[PDB]
Specification:
Chains A, B: This is Major capsid protein. This is part of a larger assembly, with 2 copies of chain A (50 residues). Chain A is largely without helices or strands. Chain A is 10% helix and 4% strand. The termini of chain A are far apart.
């Protein structure tokens, strides 16, 4: 009688797009706000006036 | 059997840093605010209308 969508299967293709995929990534706040010191070991001692 | 941080003892040296040590020193307010005079002797007389 006629050709439905099911009767032509994969001769109609379904497409892909990635317009919604690219989520942006956010850094640490405290690395942006405060000064860093590089440590070379587990402990550093910092004298402060008291 | 395995090696712990405590089992390594003082092969791991603790570090030091002076980052937090420095503090800015503050001068007298009155030496900023008022006109000063260089004295050459203990006592100076300044007459005023009374």
């Amino acid at each position: 009688a006629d050709i439905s969508r099911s009767e032509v299967a994969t001769l109609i293709q379904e497409a892909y797009a990635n317009d919604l995929l690219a989520s942006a990534k956010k850094g640490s706040t405290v690395l942006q706000a405060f000064p860093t010191v590089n440590m070379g070991t587990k402990t550093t001692h910092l004298p402060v006036l008291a």
